[PDB]
Amino acid sequence: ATPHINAEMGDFADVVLMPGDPLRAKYIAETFLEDAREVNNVRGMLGFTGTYKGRKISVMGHGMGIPSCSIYTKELITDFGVKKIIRVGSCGAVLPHVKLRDVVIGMGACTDSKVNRIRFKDHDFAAIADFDMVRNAVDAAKALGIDARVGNLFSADLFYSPDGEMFDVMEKYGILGVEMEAAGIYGVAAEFGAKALTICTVSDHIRTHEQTTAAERQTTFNDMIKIALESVLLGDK
Amino acid sequence: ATPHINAEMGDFADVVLMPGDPLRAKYIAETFLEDAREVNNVRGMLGFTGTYKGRKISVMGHGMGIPSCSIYTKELITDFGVKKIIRVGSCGAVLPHVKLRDVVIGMGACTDSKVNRIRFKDHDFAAIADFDMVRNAVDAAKALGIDARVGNLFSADLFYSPDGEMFDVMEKYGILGVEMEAAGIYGVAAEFGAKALTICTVSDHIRTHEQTTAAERQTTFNDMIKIALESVLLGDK
Amino acid sequence: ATPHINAEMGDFADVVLMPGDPLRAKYIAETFLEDAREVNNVRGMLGFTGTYKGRKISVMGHGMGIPSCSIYTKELITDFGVKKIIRVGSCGAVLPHVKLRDVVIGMGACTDSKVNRIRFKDHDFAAIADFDMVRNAVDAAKALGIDARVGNLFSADLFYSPDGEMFDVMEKYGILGVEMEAAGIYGVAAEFGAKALTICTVSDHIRTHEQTTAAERQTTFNDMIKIALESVLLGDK
Amino acid sequence: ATPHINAEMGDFADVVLMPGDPLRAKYIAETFLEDAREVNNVRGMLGFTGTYKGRKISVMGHGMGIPSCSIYTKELITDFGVKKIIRVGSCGAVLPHVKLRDVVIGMGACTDSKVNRIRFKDHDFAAIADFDMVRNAVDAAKALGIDARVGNLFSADLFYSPDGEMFDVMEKYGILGVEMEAAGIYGVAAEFGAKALTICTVSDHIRTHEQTTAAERQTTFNDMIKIALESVLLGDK
Amino acid sequence: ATPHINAEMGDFADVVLMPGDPLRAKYIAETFLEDAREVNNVRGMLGFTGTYKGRKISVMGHGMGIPSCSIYTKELITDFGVKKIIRVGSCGAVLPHVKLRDVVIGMGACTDSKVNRIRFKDHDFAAIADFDMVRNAVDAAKALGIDARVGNLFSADLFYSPDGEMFDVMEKYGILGVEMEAAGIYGVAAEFGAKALTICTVSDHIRTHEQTTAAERQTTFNDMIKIALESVLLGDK
Amino acid sequence: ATPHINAEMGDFADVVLMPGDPLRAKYIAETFLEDAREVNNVRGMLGFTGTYKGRKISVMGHGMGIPSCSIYTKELITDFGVKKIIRVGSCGAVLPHVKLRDVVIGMGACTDSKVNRIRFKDHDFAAIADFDMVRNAVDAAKALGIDARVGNLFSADLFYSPDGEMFDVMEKYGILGVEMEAAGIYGVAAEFGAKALTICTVSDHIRTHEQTTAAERQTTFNDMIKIALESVLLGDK
């Protein structure tokens, strides 16, 4: 047990899927995991562990923002022996040619935060994902007939940024999606030596204002989860 | 409703007390408020509205870190008409003379987050609280026989910081307590024209590694909620 | 004696009001103080010490800009035993709802300077005044029928700045007045463990370019100086 | 022609291998390509275009440092239709487990330069390689029996950095090798919408000041050239 | 008349000598100038205009610190048509081979201040002096039998800096002396197209805490003022 | 001897002229030098050593950009005993009055780079030249009938910069010319206690793209070379 996780060593698997919403963690456990048991709920941040096709896989929320997820990722890595972390979430798109429901693989993650600068003596630290985990995800995605876009994500600190012009800048450099924690998870991974990956589904477009229809929204969410779980399977063999 | 709050205009009172833990919000609502009704539950971020000495008071968690609490605070103001936001929580003390169970009123808040610079054209924005709210808290505390320490808090972005040297700097300029969102809340209030204040209690001492036992923890927390509540009543005249 | 102050320990009272202009210090000495004698004049910075209602009080100029006043405050603190510093001055207003002749109290102070960042390892240091000194000033004010505006001031490094847009940002973030040293004084106070406060009178509106007349200037100045002296007495009770 | 390249559009192939040294470019042209011809030489920066297994491929020196390689990469993309760019060079290792002769593939590239921040509104731009090109390079190496290391490189502006503590920070965050231009090339690629990748051989080890011998560097260099040329062929399939 | 100078157009000569102490201005006027009249005295900042060998010259204090001297210089250039400014002052040395009483001419001026960055889009602005004025100052010195040292000065915002480590860096890069306004003057000069220069005598040593004696100081001061005056004559040709 | 220069001790004169292009190095050596012998050719960076009017001098290219020239400069000073470096190149002019074919002497050098900040604890280092070398050049030019302009240059990192606005800020602050390495050389000269100077001729206007013929360029280039060479002889007196 750590200050933010009421669990003991062994209660978590070596790989953890982390959605933002703790309730999404509940859903994944009850929909894709077999014999899933609740391993944590300290601050309502539900966490579960179970088996997917015979492999033990844990699921837990990470809260909103880099500060939130950084805490949870550090403890899991340090006190629970977690080796691989896969974040599953949503992102908004700036690129017009990037449509809704598109699966985005965060090879790297640009950011608004200063976390990386504090760690890297105010130099540019490229927050990147693990090559093998990205590869596995790509291979697992196309196996399901889904075309995933491997590229740059943008981790924002402020969901409500006062700098509108930044969207134009993001588009010019081709960031695939803007979310709020990929870069942080990557910093934490590099610092404590673990492997990480962030997979997102474009839920809404900053330009062509439109969100996914609830039904299709949940369908694509499940496609993403399948992609994640399958990549893990593909990753240990 | 908002993308992070499943409530309607009118479901929230003009004053909202915000602890970090969703479960603490529920505790306050069920122990101090009368006829508390759940008004929010999207990501388990429980929100409740009730009564206190006739005064309509709301309580809701804000999560961990500046980016998390910033989203909720902004939505409560712009979408639910909240006028005053009072953060209740705990902090770590760095100064030798500051002891556990001390009540710290964050008149100002230092931070290593870049959210303020993004807003203030990369200059120094003194994230400060509302004066009358600070004063109201000192009056309520004094009436309760609880001596309060008014000063600067430090909102860290990384609970697990790689820069252990910063604690010395903090001590050097006498920061009363270290926590994770005061600066962001003060940043939001100033941007959207609201009033904010963060009250904290010393739960641990950075230097002399002291922690409050479970019993004291609950006791001091109660004293803190008591202070914030009476504070609001004082501010009505 | 110091390289900037030709006096010995005892020549200065424990509290010292500090106007910008040394000529204004001479004024206060002979208009408000009793038995006030000149204790310093090294660089024209006239310093005086006398009595107000039997309380020993000193008055000395601080020059224009943070680096200037930072020298005098530092020296008074460490070599002349000054406990409280109360800068009394003028400022310009950006907010339309802030009228000429208004007395603004600086609870916090933003700045274009880098001094704070040099001290605070490039982070965000909230340059704040002493709380007790703030309410004391506010109380003295109301005792004279004056309702002071308590908030953020902005200590500019450049009177003639090549950045006009900065005023707009100031307006949206509610800064009450633009002056040039509160931030520095607050930084010094925090570094050497002393208490400080800055009270200003709106001499002009930067937006609606309207200046206070020499007549109004006198009347408001007297009022402010009165407030500062009375607050001191309140702090002795 | 451009101000730095005396060639007509069409003289370069859609893919360009770029070593730091122009003489090494000539070496690759005469040693690995068939019917290679000199397509540029304005400043001794030799540029050749020839064929490899029937595929048209160009080779051109890029010079030392981000400013030098940035000029060339941009011009090739914008005025010569170059689609892919592969930098081949050496790098020094700082991690204990990264041995000499090891082939390092820069999936990402950290940096000392301010070029990225100048493009990215002073935020963190994660300079990354093209996922497909990285994958192809890994497979090409695998087929040849070479175990490639995929990860983060560090592009330094100062070969002789007065800051030696940086090497330890690099070691702490797992950078695989330090060179001088990958981050710049990746920045240009993202700005002008092209594909890039840098492959390096570990020729020196910062910690245990060990270096490769004349024989070791010639042989390992050719292995790298093969991996690059083969990764391209693999990319057309 | 300006917000800080009650003089009128024409009251100032095309060149002004600007010592730090307003009193030194008085001394210069009442020693090196004939028919000198007090054209300014507002904040005790004495400004006189006289004649030196038929050459009309003004002298005026500028206060201590970049913000102070920036105001006076700006107004003198913009409203009083002053074409050349010559700051005369003391400076502490850090280089061992620099001895007390030495005459240092600042061709350039490093700094801690953020004023330049605000002016230069956060880039590095080389705060330099006017060449001809430097060459003339060297010549005047030669004729007077003095060997002046031309190089970099360091204009510090903080006389009581929290980090003495910076002094080692200053030494490392051979800076001749540390004062508090050269960089601000040079910035204003460039911003408005005026010519400026700063001449300093080594009043003390940082490493070897040794201050110059008042006796030596007076004569040295006179030697420097003579240099600055002789140089003005050389520039008129 | 060094990893970037395959020459030996004594093979270089204590002074070295450095054009950007190594082909130019060859040109200068075969047009102005007597018995010039090739001393280095490693990366095609042609270095020569000869005699001009009895005085032994060297010429060597430095490549494009601060990083490249920083490498060569450091090695010449620390490993080959070079006492002074003169960079001979071209620069684009922003000021209207600065005409084509004019000779600009960089007394100081503003920059886009972060190298100086790395060396000067993130403060403003005034990248300046050796005064003596500057005045010798202006004199050599005057003797040749050319009135050189002495002021500030801007050493840019990006030849193809996305921020087109910087050109107006430069214009406002009077920079004489834009180029890519002066601030870097001056930085190395300061770190290793050597003397440097950069002379440039206006090849074209960044504003109105006025382009001069290769013939006029050739001629003007030679004038600059003659000035640089003569100044060296004057430097021996």
Curated annotation (Swiss-Prot), chains A, B, C, D, E, F:
Membership in a protein family: Belongs to the PNP/UDP phosphorylase family.
Modification N6-acetyllysine, positions: 26
Positions bound to a purine D-ribonucleoside: 4, 179-181, 203-204
EC number: 2.4.2.1
Binding site for phosphate: 20, 24, 43, 87-90
GO cellular component, one term: cytosol
Pfam family, one: PNP_UDP_1
Sample GO molecular function, one term: identical protein binding
Reactions mediated catalytically: a purine D-ribonucleoside + phosphate = a purine nucleobase + alpha-D-ribose 1-phosphate; a purine 2'-deoxy-D-ribonucleoside + phosphate = a purine nucleobase + 2-deoxy-alpha-D-ribose 1-phosphate; inosine + phosphate = alpha-D-ribose 1-phosphate + hypoxanthine; adenosine + phosphate = alpha-D-ribose 1-phosphate + adenine
Function: Catalyzes the reversible phosphorolytic breakdown of the N-glycosidic bond in the beta-(deoxy)ribonucleoside molecules, with the formation of the corresponding free purine bases and pentose-1-phosphate. Acts on 6-amino and 6-oxopurines including deoxyinosine, deoxyguanosine, deoxyadenosine, adenosine, guanosine, and inosine. Does not act on xanthosine. May also catalyze a phosphate-dependent transfer of the pentose moiety from one purine base to another.
Subunit-structure text: Homohexamer; trimer of homodimers.
Resulting phenotype, residue 204 to A/N: Severe loss of catalytic activity
Keywords, alphabetical: Acetylation, Glycosyltransferase, Transferase
Gene name tied to this protein: deoD
Xref: PROSITE patterns: PNP_UDP_1
Active-site residue list: 204 (proton donor)
pH and activity: Optimum pH is 7.1 for deoxyinosine as substrate. Optimum pH is 7.5 for inosine as substrate. Optimum pH is 8.2 for hypoxanthine as substrate.
Protein name in the entry: Purine nucleoside phosphorylase DeoD-type
One GO BP annotation of this record: purine nucleoside interconversion
Enzyme category, top tier: transferase
Residues at the site labelled Important for catalytic activity: 217
